[PDB]
Design an enzyme around this catalytic site. Structure first.
Site, PDB file in Angstrom:
ATOM      1  N   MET A   1       0.838  -1.192   0.000  1.00 55.48           N
ATOM      2  CA  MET A   1       0.000   0.000   0.000  1.00 55.48           C
ATOM      3  C   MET A   1       0.877   1.247   0.000  1.00 55.48           C
ATOM      4  SD  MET A   1      -3.480  -0.864   2.333  1.00 55.48           S
ATOM      5  CE  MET A   1      -2.634  -0.400   4.037  1.00 55.48           C
TER       6      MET A   1
ATOM      7  N   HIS B   1       9.343  -3.889   3.233  1.00 59.12           N
ATOM      8  CA  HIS B   1       8.922  -4.107   1.854  1.00 59.12           C
ATOM      9  C   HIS B   1      10.107  -4.470   0.967  1.00 59.12           C
ATOM     10  CE1 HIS B   1       5.738  -1.165   3.342  1.00 59.12           C
ATOM     11  NE2 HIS B   1       5.062  -2.270   3.083  1.00 59.12           N
TER      12      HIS B   1
ATOM     13  N   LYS C   1       4.575 -10.302   9.756  1.00 56.13           N
ATOM     14  CA  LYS C   1       3.990  -9.413  10.756  1.00 56.13           C
ATOM     15  C   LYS C   1       2.468  -9.449  10.726  1.00 56.13           C
ATOM     16  CE  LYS C   1       3.371  -5.032  10.642  1.00 56.13           C
ATOM     17  NZ  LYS C   1       3.662  -3.646  10.184  1.00 56.13           N
TER      18      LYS C   1
HETATM   19  C1  LIG Z   1       1.827  -1.987   3.127  1.00 54.06           C
HETATM   20  S1  LIG Z   1       1.539  -3.654   3.782  1.00 54.06           S
HETATM   21  C2  LIG Z   1      -0.262  -3.750   3.574  1.00 54.06           C
HETATM   22  C3  LIG Z   1      -0.758  -4.653   2.450  1.00 54.06           C
HETATM   23  C4  LIG Z   1      -2.283  -4.747   2.387  1.00 54.06           C
HETATM   24  N1  LIG Z   1      -2.809  -5.612   3.440  1.00 54.06           N
HETATM   25  C5  LIG Z   1      -2.759  -5.194   1.006  1.00 54.06           C
HETATM   26  O1  LIG Z   1      -2.200  -6.104   0.394  1.00 54.06           O
HETATM   27  O2  LIG Z   1      -3.721  -4.638   0.475  1.00 54.06           O
HETATM   28  C6  LIG Z   1       2.231  -4.676   2.451  1.00 54.06           C
HETATM   29  C7  LIG Z   1       3.120  -5.846   2.890  1.00 54.06           C
HETATM   30  O3  LIG Z   1       4.252  -5.441   3.650  1.00 54.06           O
HETATM   31  C8  LIG Z   1       4.517  -6.424   4.636  1.00 54.06           C
HETATM   32  N2  LIG Z   1       5.217  -5.886   5.818  1.00 54.06           N
HETATM   33  C9  LIG Z   1       4.821  -4.822   6.587  1.00 54.06           C
HETATM   34  N3  LIG Z   1       5.725  -4.644   7.578  1.00 54.06           N
HETATM   35  C10 LIG Z   1       6.688  -5.583   7.455  1.00 54.06           C
HETATM   36  C11 LIG Z   1       7.830  -5.848   8.202  1.00 54.06           C
HETATM   37  N4  LIG Z   1       8.124  -5.091   9.257  1.00 54.06           N
HETATM   38  N5  LIG Z   1       8.655  -6.894   7.842  1.00 54.06           N
HETATM   39  C12 LIG Z   1       8.337  -7.670   6.745  1.00 54.06           C
HETATM   40  N6  LIG Z   1       7.200  -7.405   6.006  1.00 54.06           N
HETATM   41  C13 LIG Z   1       6.385  -6.375   6.355  1.00 54.06           C
HETATM   42  C14 LIG Z   1       3.163  -6.998   5.006  1.00 54.06           C
HETATM   43  O4  LIG Z   1       3.273  -8.343   5.400  1.00 54.06           O
HETATM   44  C15 LIG Z   1       2.373  -6.879   3.722  1.00 54.06           C
HETATM   45  O5  LIG Z   1       2.410  -8.113   3.050  1.00 54.06           O
END
Ligand SMILES: C[S@@+](CC[C@H](N)C(=O)[O-])C[C@H]1O[C@@H](n2cnc3c(N)ncnc32)[C@H](O)[C@@H]1O
Ligand SMILES: C[S@@+](CC[C@H](N)C(=O)[O-])C[C@H]1O[C@@H](n2cnc3c(N)ncnc32)[C@H](O)[C@@H]1O
Lengths: 262, 261
Positions: B30, B37, B150
Site C-alpha cells: 500500500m 517491503h 507481521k
Molecule cells: C503496506 S503492507 C499492507 C498490504 C495490504 N494488506 C494489502 O495487500 O492490500 C504490504 C506488505 O508489507 C509487509 N510488511 C509490513 N511490515 C513488514 C515488516 N516489518 N517486515 C516484513 N514485512 C512487512 C506486510 O506483510 C504486507 O504483506
C-alpha cells in the site's frame, strides 16, 4: 466419447490438456436436465469447440433445508441426455471437492438487486450461488458462460461477479424455455402433482390475459386458483413474481409487453 | 527501465506480453515502502524473472476513517526505491480501476481466526483485505506471492483464499524486519513523533525482557510507558499484540520462546 470427471483432480487433468486456441463453453447446472438446460447446451455447442457442463447441487444456496433434500436427482438420465448432445466434458464434483474446508470464504452481495425479490425471499441464496459460480469459473476457466433468463437477478449478479473479479469470460444469456401454457420449465416442477399442473396452467392463463396494471387485483386472481403468491412486482418493463403450489415453489419473470409469450 | 502501469488496460498490455516460461513474482503493498517491503522485493527478485509490485491504498479495508486519511503517501520516493531495486512492473491503480461500480461484491470470512485478535479489533478489515487481494491476484496472475510474517492472520487467510478459489499461486512468507530495539517496521511508523518513537523503544525494551507468563502485569508495564495496549494474547506458540501511541496503531506477533529478536 464424453469424458465424465467425478472429481476436481481428473478435471484439472482434462482442462490442462486443452490449448489456448480452443473456444471453451461452460454451462453450469444442478442436474435434472430439461429442455431449458438443453437450449443452453445447444447454444454452447454452436459457438464453441469444447462444451463443459457441470452438475452440482450446491448446498450453500439453499436457504430452505427441505428444498435441498427434495431436489430432483436423476444423474444417469442426465448423463444420457448430455451424451446425446455430444457434450465434451461432464464435471460432476462432490461437496468436499468444491468446499474442502466447508463454506469459510463467501461472496456477499451488498447491492440493491440482491436485496429485493429472490434475495428478499431467499436469504443467503445469492451468497451461496455467487460463491460456487466463482469456484466453478476458477476451475473451468471458460471462454463463454451460458445463463438462462429465468433467473434474472442471478444473471445480473454473475455479470457483476465476472466484472468485479476480472474473469475473462463472455456471458451469453438465453431466453426462458416455456411450456405451451407459458409455465417456465423448471427442475422443481418434477415434484408437481397432477392437479398442481392444472393450477399452474390456470395462473398463466390469467397472466396472458392481464395487462398488469392492477397488481393487487392480479394477486387475488392468482390466489383464487389455489396457489399462494409470494411476491409480484414490476421492475423496468419486466414483471417478477414467485408463488407456491403445494410444497413446490415456482418463480418467473417476463417482459410486460409480451407476458409469458412462446 | 521500470514500467509504471497506472490503470488496468495498461497493465493487461504488459502482462499479456509475458511468456508462460517467465516466473512472475508479485509483492502487493500500500505504498510508503520501508525496509520490510524491500526485503520482500529482494526475495522476489532472487526467485523470479519478472517481479510485479503493486501500490494501492485499499479504502475498503480501513475500518477507521482517520487511519485512511492520514495513511502515509510518498509515491515519488516509492518509485525511486522500486527503480533502484530494478522492479520490472509497478501497478499503481486508482480506486475506480479496482472498484468500477463501488464495493458491491465482498469476500466475507466466516472463520475462526477472522474473529479473534485483529479481526475483532478491526471490523470489516479482513473482508476488505481479502476482496482486494483476490482482485489483485486476478489482475496480475503470478506464480509467487510474497507476504510478511507481521500480518500473521492475513497470511493464513490469504492461504485459505488461494486454496478456496483455486488460484495457482505459491505463497512465500518472509520474516518480520525489525528496528534494533525490536520494533517491527511499519508504514504507519512514519506518523510517529520523536517522543512516540521513544515510547515504542521502551515498550520493546519491556517485551525483550518478558517471559509472557503474566500478560496482565505486562499490560500494565506497557500502559505505563504512555501507550495504550489494545490486546495481547497467546495463540498456540506465538504472542500477538496491538497498541496505540497517540493516533498511531501498532501490531506485532512473534514466538513466545524468542520474542521480538
Ligand atoms: C503496506 S503492507 C499492507 C498490504 C495490504 N494488506 C494489502 O495487500 O492490500 C504490504 C506488505 O508489507 C509487509 N510488511 C509490513 N511490515 C513488514 C515488516 N516489518 N517486515 C516484513 N514485512 C512487512 C506486510 O506483510 C504486507 O504483506
Ligand atoms: C438448474 S439452474 C441452477 C444453477 C445454480 N444456480 C448454480 O449453482 O449454478 C442451471 C441453469 O439453467 C438455466 N435454466 C433453468 N431453467 C431454464 C429455463 N426454463 N429456460 C432457460 N434456462 C433455464 C438457469 O438460468 C441456470 O443458468
Amino acid at each position: 466419447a464424453m469424458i465424465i470427471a467425478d472429481n476436481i483432480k481428473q478435471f484439472h487433468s482434462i482442462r490442462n490438456s486443452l490449448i489456448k486456441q480452443q473456444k471453451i463453453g461452460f454451462v453450469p447446472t444442478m442436474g435434472a436436465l430439461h429442455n431449458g438446460h438443453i437450449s443452453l447446451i445447444k447454444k454452447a455447442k454452436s459457438e464453441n469447440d469444447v462444451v463443459i457442463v457441470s452438475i452440482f447441487v450446491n448446498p450453500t444456496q439453499f436457504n430452505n433445508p427441505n428444498d435441498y433434500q427434495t431436489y430432483p436427482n436423476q444423474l444417469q438420465q442426465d448423463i444420457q441426455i448430455l451424451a446425446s448432445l455430444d457434450v465434451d466434458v461432464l464435471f460432476n464434483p462432490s461437496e468436499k471437492d468444491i468446499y474442502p474446508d466447508g463454506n469459510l470464504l463467501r461472496i456477499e452481495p451488498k447491492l440493491e438487486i440482491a436485496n429485493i425479490l429472490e434475495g428478499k425471499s431467499r436469504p443467503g441464496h445469492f451468497s451461496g450461488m455467487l460463491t460456487v459460480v466463482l469456484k466453478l469459473l476458477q476451475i473451468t476457466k471458460p471462454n463463454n458462460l451460458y445463463l438462462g433468463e429465468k433467473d434474472y437477478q442471478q444473471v445480473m449478479l454473475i455479470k457483476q461477479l465476472v466484472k468485479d473479479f476480472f474473469i475473462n469470460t463472455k456471458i451469453i444469456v438465453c431466453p426462458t424455455q416455456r411450456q405451451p401454457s407459458g409455465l417456465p420449465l423448471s427442475s422443481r416442477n418434477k415434484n408437481l402433482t397432477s392437479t398442481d399442473i392444472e393450477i399452474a396452467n390456470k395462473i398463466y392463463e390469467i397472466l396472458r390475459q392481464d395487462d398488469f396494471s392492477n397488481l393487487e387485483e392480479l394477486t387475488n386472481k392468482i390466489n383464487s386458483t389455489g396457489a399462494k403468491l409470494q411476491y409480484i412486482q414490476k421492475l423496468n418493463n419486466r414483471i417478477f413474481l414467485a408463488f407456491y403450489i403445494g410444497k413446490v415453489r415456482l418463480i418467473d419473470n417476463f417482459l410486460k409487453e409480451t407476458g409469458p409469450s412462446c
